[PDB]
Design a protein around this nucleic acid. Structure first.
Ligand code: CA
Ligand code: MG
Ligand code: MG
Length: 430
DNA sequence: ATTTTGACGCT
DNA sequence: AGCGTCAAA
């Protein structure tokens, strides 16, 4: 009752660029704008593997992970842009730089947590309080929320999408109590006003469109973001949670898309997130462990406490290449040549990182997979990273993996290597 | 033969 | 420290 916390203390947004790599290529090549297009890596094997797809192409059924030849079967007029290749491998530099562009715009508004190359969480609590004192009890106009959906509305006693959006927003604003500065729904609404402004700034200054979720925690912000894509934002209030969760498959909640979510479904015999409310915390802890149990118990009620971490920069810098099927590396020289290629790209990125962000990596992680191994990594070993020098780094990696060669012969490597991975970690200020 | 990434938990 | 899980374009 009067003491049960409700997790309404923060305003958190999640901003996710729409079909990010496609928008990077469409900005660069206007011929691709407003067309079914996709971004592909490599070209030789089945036309390349698709990694990003415009909404126009998704309408034909084109997806990520599809081979371009197969996507062309679904969408004969599909346009393709190829990821740059350098030193024999895919090079993602253009997209990393466009991402930095967007994160720097977002950082002007608030503390952000970089969640991936194209997504960031935003803690808007303080900015919301400032906007609320500036507003001075003034009602919030629908005009300040031109692309906002209110999850769960309209409800109760037009057939076009934008009509429904405005009806729901009108119901929400009609209800709002702008008299109380501590009102969580008012705080979320002001959050949404700020996110509209941030999204406008991103589009004005980069050309890129994005979607956003606004709620009281990261999990609900992330779920909200996906409810109305592309180029829209969705507010998920605390009161919307019971109905939203009553038909929400467990796997849709972040961290439950894999084995743990599968076990929640199997062990408890449920399908939707709301059904979790019928278990005690101790029951959930018994099945899924103390940490997971407590998390599930609060989450199914819409409550989560994971903070938006102040981290705008990635914590590791890695380079990896697969050598699938018959291309697996079977000679010592091949292995050394590819270690050099990886180390040269890594050196270039590390040097740029040191100049831009005043830090230096101190550990080099080398990972390999051998033909036959079921796991993603067959071997992970670390060593000192003392100089941003590709020849030294490639030598150190070879030194640390050379004992993996079963082969009795000199020049041959067995079992053949199907993957190489170099990752610089453990950054220190410089 | 999705590939190339990046964060975080367990022990 | 090394391994596993979950997620991203
Ligand atoms: Ca995206
Ligand atoms: Mg995303
Ligand atoms: Mg995606």
């Amino acid at each position: 009752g009067p003491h049960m916390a409700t997790g309404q203390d923060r305003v958190v947004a999640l901003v996710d660029m729409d079909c990010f790599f496609v928008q990077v290529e469409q900005r660069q090549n206007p011929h691709l704008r407003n067309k079914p297009c996709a971004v592909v890596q490599y070209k030789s094997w089945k036309g390349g593997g698709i990694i990003a797809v415009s909404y126009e192409a998704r309408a034909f059924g084109v997806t990520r992970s599809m081979w371009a030849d197969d996507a062309k079967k679904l969408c004969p007029d599909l346009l393709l842009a190829q990821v740059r290749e350098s030193r024999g491998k895919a090079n993602l530099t253009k997209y990393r730089e466009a991402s930095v562009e967007v994160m720097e715009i977002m950082s002007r508004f608030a503390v952000i947590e970089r969640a991936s190359i194209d997504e960031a969480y935003v803690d808007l609590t303080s900015a919301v309080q400032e906007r609320l004192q500036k507003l001075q009890g003034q009602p919030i106009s629908a005009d300040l929320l031109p692309s906002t959906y209110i999850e769960g509305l309209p409800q109760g006693p037009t057939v076009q999408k934008e009509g429904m959006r405005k009806q729901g927003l009108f119901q929400w604003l009609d209800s709002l109590q702008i008299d109380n500065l501590t009102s969580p729904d008012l705080q979320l609404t002001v959050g949404a006003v700020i996110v509209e402004e941030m999204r406008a700034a991103i589009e004005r200054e980069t050309g890129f469109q994005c979607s956003a979720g606004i709620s009281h925690n990261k999990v609900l912000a992330k779920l909200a973001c996906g409810l109305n894509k592309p180029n829209r934002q969705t507010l998920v209030s605390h009161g919307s949670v019971p109905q939203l969760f009553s038909q929400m498959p467990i796997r849709k909640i972040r961290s439950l898309g894999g084995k743990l979510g599968a076990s929640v479904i199997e062990i408890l015999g449920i399908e939707y997130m709301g059904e979790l409310t019928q278990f005690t915390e101790s029951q959930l802890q018994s099945h899924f462990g103390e940490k997971n149990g407590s998390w599930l118990y609060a989450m199914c009620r819409g409550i989560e406490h994971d903070p938006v971490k102040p981290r705008q920069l990635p914590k590791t810098i890695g380079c990896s290449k697969n050598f699938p099927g018959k291309t697996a590396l079977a000679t010592r020289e091949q292995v050394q040549w590819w270690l050099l290629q990886l180390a040269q790209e890594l050196e270039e990125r590390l040097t740029k990182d040191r100049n831009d962000n005043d830090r230096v990596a101190t550990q080099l992680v080398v990972s390999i997979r051998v033909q036959g191994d079921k796991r993603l990594s067959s071997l992970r070993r670390c060593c000192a990273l003392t100089r941003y020098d590709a020849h030294k780094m490639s030598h150190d990696a070879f030194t640390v993996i050379k004992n993996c060669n079963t082969s009795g012969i000199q020049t041959e490597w067995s079992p053949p290597l199907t993957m190489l991975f170099l990752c610089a970690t453990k950054f220190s200020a410089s």
